[PDB]
Write a protein that binds this ligand. Structure first.
Ligand SMILES: Cc1cc2nc3c(=O)[nH]c(=O)nc-3n(C[C@H](O)[C@H](O)[C@H](O)COP(=O)(O)O)c2cc1C
Ligand SMILES: Cc1cc2nc3c(=O)[nH]c(=O)nc-3n(C[C@H](O)[C@H](O)[C@H](O)COP(=O)(O)O)c2cc1C
Ligand SMILES: Cc1cc2nc3c(=O)[nH]c(=O)nc-3n(C[C@H](O)[C@H](O)[C@H](O)COP(=O)(O)O)c2cc1C
Ligand SMILES: Cc1cc2nc3c(=O)[nH]c(=O)nc-3n(C[C@H](O)[C@H](O)[C@H](O)COP(=O)(O)O)c2cc1C
Ligand SMILES: O=C(O)C(=O)c1ccccc1
Ligand SMILES: O=C(O)C(=O)c1ccccc1
Ligand SMILES: O=C(O)C(=O)c1ccccc1
Ligand SMILES: O=C(O)C(=O)c1ccccc1
Lengths: 389, 392, 392, 389
């Protein structure tokens, strides 16, 4: 580092930020946040586990899936709303649990996320971190609409007292569901943080069990989503104990490196749910690496009831507050609407597997290392040139 | 978004552009064009939809196909002519439609392509854009030969009167086919272009988003002109088109300018044609192909899988934009020569002889995404090294 | 080939080397070492055979394997201890043998690794090189714990007297196994090393090129020590070894320092073990594995495929070369911690629970060589772009 | 470019060339030749057809093949000699037809290649280009040994006169075989040449046929090798008309781009020759991309009776004359001898397929294009650092 070059920082965000309606991608947010946040706000957001392969593979795995679009379909009118978890929602995506948004947005934090999510026309669901820089309550009333649905993610404590008080507290406060993170019994090693800063907590119980969940069902009517599943064998398990849904997630490539990409697990497990009757029973959400509407459409096409994005909404918020979060919402809505149209379908229910080319899902390759010498002495062809005067 | 750079640019167009006979390949026009077109002519020509993957993948797919050349064949004499949509043509490729050719050739635009195509000993079909700078009237009158063939690319307006008028107008003017574009109900989001200026908006009256199979069936009744459905991205819609009895189809994703993650047309081609035999609709429907074609060996692969002809857009745009009409001819010339030589070395002498027995198709589906690599392992790794030369 | 650079270097060793507690991962020792070892200590440690592909591929192969973690498991308590060659050890990894440790730790060499291993709360087996700077006498006397275990890496001399003497000497000194290296009949050609100085020569008396199965069978008679054949590169020779009844085998290609295009040991492991069941030689032979292991998740994959333990060379070399003995301990410590955390998140609590049901093996064989790409297509292609920040 | 910077050139080759016994690879030759030859000597040597994919793929395809080496084998003694085409040879490799060696070696040319090939202990066969800068005769007596075998490659002319005189001429002059190039009916487009320089000949007949070959059998007793085959279907054909051998070759990636790699064709066709009895009948040689002994061993392992290298021997010769050519010979001999030893076999006849891992021969991949934006804003992990004073 922190270094009177948070003076160079304050230059950048000062007006030098381009007009919010010059932002095109979710990547644009990320570039801008990369240059401006404090070294440690940035480390904490961008960071992944160890060598960061899963964090990246989460994204790249969408690129193993292509489209077989229908043409000569009337797409004048398209509708991207659907139902997640009792409520009915405007988009098929949501903000996912990011902890500690005061590092990026100092004054307003995850209040400004709630503003963003129903301050404009489109109304998006919001997961709230158990490590929120704000209180659940602070957030929920910063909301500009009773129509905007909210969701609580929960680290069950080792004091089954404290976490019983929280479930009763959040019920009383509006939230229409409970998202129980289970992929962080030990917090993952994020070395970008450490290098600059120069793994069991009690906040998060590693004792957590299936039986402990079965019990969380009884103590509440709120729908329950085991957020952090990483194989088919445990989706089936969540069905077998009839929880509401499940997020296919690996905590944003932040827990176990070489966890697979949710999109690839998704594609494995939805066929297995039809082959066991369990289709209807479980909502199957999906996060990680999602940065474009075509990603969101691949997920939905495969079976996802809804798809979460974390870091992007941090980065937008971190840069442009609640307004950032909305533009980012609209950005993604427009991406989804156009690609649907070009896909040749008009509702989320028509987003099926027969729209996807899945022939190369499994082409997750590692090439043999480059012949250094052969390639150093090779000279490629050259483009024709121009001249003199 | 241009900046008395016009002089930096004009200075290169200026005699710095090398002689036309110094152009070896199609990639040269593309380079010359990148340095001399106006910032937004370049963005509009060069760009594709969103992250731009289909656009690139259209080309690279050609490279998952290899050859099984026949040796010891009398390849003295080679005929690259074939037939498209009922005309006989000199060449098994065509100039796909490309809107706004004045951005890069302000004086003559599409008229100069029409001359490039019909002027030389080798002449090539020209599809004309519905949203071309010039009039069809102007572009057709511009043609140097009666024998040269020009097709019409149609966007059906949502005011089907305007459209009925247009079709009537262009069959009167003597165009030989209608390429109705179906891959743009919403206009693709090309971000290099947007990044310069600074959802119902990317819909518009001028290209009807409700165009349907039933429409094309009616289009077919209202005209004697052969109809080609341009913009098909899956085998399912080639069959649908064989069923309404239309003359043909372009497997195409609009040069990667509409839907990202549309497959490479060559890939759709290769799965499509076998099915077109399995249901004996083989020669009931001419299947064209476009996107990412830049070499004559590219063309050969598509012909060997069964395409009736293969289209090119940006390369003719870039050639026309640096060298106007003799640019266009040079590219025809360059690509023609590529097809001829590669045909000899492939071991065939005609277009009808270009069949699948010549392709090695085994690695066609090796569309890979590698696992992200190990920035740290590679960071500290030091590679071998060449020997040196001493000191002085 | 060193050049009063020794000061440039000494200046970094100098207090510029960061505190040991600032080392996060094994790649850090490797970097620090690259800047501070003497030009030819670095070439001898870092180098591999010829174009160096196996050496790199040993690592990257680990990355064609992914995990199927078990969730909602009581992972409060985790035991990373297992058993090797009849001893019980704290940890499922070991320090493979590495010759000439004084090049990088001139004062103490192998003795410092022996202390790094036996000194802390967590202690780790040490294989000792036949061609180590120090004496076995010296390295064994250097050990901090009775409980710590040290193995002997044997090259059989072509004068089998010298060898008979050696084996006798080291069982007297209390080593717990003999790792006879069979992957160096000719010594691999490491060109970074050769490039500094400026076929019967790369053969030598000191490592007998005629070593045979019949020899190892006799070696086994002459000693009570468990024997491990170190350097096996195919399943066929694991079976041959189960047949002469030897205690075990290291699937290994010598850290990529002998034969280029030897397969990744993890790959040989994964095909080998299933066969070791199919012929019920499952627990008749302990299969170790080495090369390219740098993360605790690397170790886990090998354990999950059935390896009895997994070895590391260069990383302990580099750690010992920057930080001597507390370097070594830190790496043990670092790698141990990696294995523990990754075990929790994998959903298991012991080494016996690490089985194949946890690995995703489907893309294990996607060892690709991509087609050379299109320098010209990519040359003129311009990629999308991020938005900007204004001016001041 | 040609430009009184052939003055910078003459600097380099002047003594600045490292001692010939500081050369380790065939690549080292290539680097040195890259810096020294005239722009056009270099263009003409390095050049490939069009985009140069086949030229490169020729090499890289060896890297799809790995080894399953035998250990605990007595390899004290190894023997790499074998028989090619009547004669018995010291190595299993040979120099292949490179045309025009006076561009690189001005005074001595392909005479210095013949010196190189039997001037030292090991004695390697030499193909002589029909476009040799020297006469067949000039070369053959520049040879320092009657033991060193020679070979003539032949462009049949359209004047079946001129080429009938040549076959009778070369017979009379020693050459133990005839190599009929058939992959250049039209000369391939080499754009590196053209760019600096700013496709039917009669020298080379495109009328050439199978029947024309059948006839070349009768007019000579010299063994005949149809050099330039690129599919299995034509190896079979060469057998069917009982010619002696055949080179699996695509003229060094200089004729048809997207011709396959000879090593991959080799592996396809040798099984097909056993499955049709034709194993014994045909010698199957192999060139392209061969730069290391491990390449040469993969070929042999698969069935190759012998493996040709072109450009490397040009580059060595171009730099160090006949002495260059020998060192390059010995370099490759030592590579072959060591890797055999480490392979655990002692004669060329024991080099079989069971030594090779062929499971990924067919992993000739094209990856999907890189996500430019995602990768631009990504920041990798970073190595720990060092400090201050
Ligand atoms: C900065 C940071 C903090 C996070 N904190 C939590 C948390 O407390 N609980 C949780 O379940 N997920 C947490 N996540 C993960 C997400 O809810 C989500 O699973 C992840 O961000 C999805 O990946 P993405 O960022 O690529 O979209 C966090 C993610 C980030 C990047
Ligand atoms: C600048 C630009 C304008 C285009 N305009 C049209 C158009 O108006 N109508 C149409 O049907 N296709 C249009 N296309 C698509 C092409 O006809 C063609 O499918 C594309 O150029 C094929 O890709 P390529 O540029 O890789 O060869 C356009 C393409 C470009 C690049
Ligand atoms: C500098 C160096 C010296 C080695 N010396 C020996 C040796 O004397 N004997 C032996 O059996 N292995 C020796 N090895 C091989 C290792 O024991 C081990 O197999 C290798 O280090 C595993 O690869 P890694 O460095 O990727 O972990 C040596 C390796 C290195 C890098
Ligand atoms: C400079 C140059 C000239 C060549 N001239 C001929 C020729 O006249 N006839 C022929 O059959 N091959 C000719 N070749 C090809 C070779 O004999 C051989 O097939 C090729 O060089 C093998 O590939 P490599 O250089 O990668 O080893 C030539 C190759 C080069 C590089
Ligand atoms: O940052 C995180 O990934 C996270 O999940 C978390 C959980 C609890 C407290 C702080 C952060
Ligand atoms: O730019 C284009 O790709 C295009 O086809 C088009 C279509 C209609 C209007 C403008 C451009
Ligand atoms: O350097 C080596 O890899 C090695 O193992 C060794 C073996 C014998 C002598 C010297 C080094
Ligand atoms: O250079 C060549 O590839 C070649 O084969 C050749 C053939 C005849 C004359 C000159 C060159």
């Amino acid at each position: 580092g922190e270094t009177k070059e948070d003076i160079a920082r304050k230059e950048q965000l000062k007006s030098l930020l381009p007009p919010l309606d010059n932002i095109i991608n979710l990547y644009d947010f990320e570039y801008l946040a990369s240059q401006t946040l404090t070294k440690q706000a940035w480390a904490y957001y961008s960071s992944g586990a160890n060598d960061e392969v899963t964090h990246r593979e989460n994204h790249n795995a969408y690129h193993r899936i292509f489209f077989k679009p229908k043409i000569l379909v009337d797409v004048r009118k398209v509708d991207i709303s659907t139902d997640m978890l009792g409520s009915h929602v405007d988009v098929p995506f949501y903000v996912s649990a990011t902890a500690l948004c005061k590092l990026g947005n100092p004054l307003e934090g995850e209040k400004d996320v709630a503003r963003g999510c129903g301050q404009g026309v489109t109304k998006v669901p919001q997961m709230i971190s158990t490590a929120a820089s704000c209180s659940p309550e602070e957030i929920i009333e910063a909301a500009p609409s009773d129509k905007q649905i909210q969701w609580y993610q929960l680290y069950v404590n080792s004091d089954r007292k404290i976490t019983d008080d929280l479930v009763k507290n959040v019920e009383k406060l509006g939230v229409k569901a409970l998202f129980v993170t289970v992929d962080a019994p030990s917090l993952g090693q994020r070395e970008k943080d450490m290098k600059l800063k120069f793994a069991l907590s009690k906040f998060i119980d590693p004792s957590l069990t299936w039986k402990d969940i079965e019990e969380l069902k009884k103590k509440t009517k709120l729908p329950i989503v085991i957020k952090g599943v990483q194989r088919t064998e445990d989706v089936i398990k969540a069905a077998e104990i009839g929880v509401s849904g499940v997020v296919l997630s690996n905590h944003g490539g932040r827990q176990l490196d070489f966890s697979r990409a949710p999109i690839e697990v998704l594609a494995e497990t939805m066929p297995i749910l039809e082959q066991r009757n369990l289709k209807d029973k479980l909502e199957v959400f999906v996060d990680g690496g999602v940065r474009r509407g075509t990603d969101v459409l691949k997920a939905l096409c495969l079976g996802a009831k809804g798809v979460g994005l974390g870091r992007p909404f941090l980065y937008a918020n971190s840069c442009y507050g609640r307004n950032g979060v909305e533009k980012a919402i609209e950005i993604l809505r427009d991406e989804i609407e156009m690609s649907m149209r070009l896909l040749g379908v008009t509702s989320i229910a028509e987003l099926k597997p027969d729209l996807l080319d899945l022939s190369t899902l499994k082409a997750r390759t590692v090439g043999v290392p480059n012949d250094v010498l052969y390639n150093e002495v090779y000279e490629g062809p050259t483009l024709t040139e121009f001249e003199d005067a």
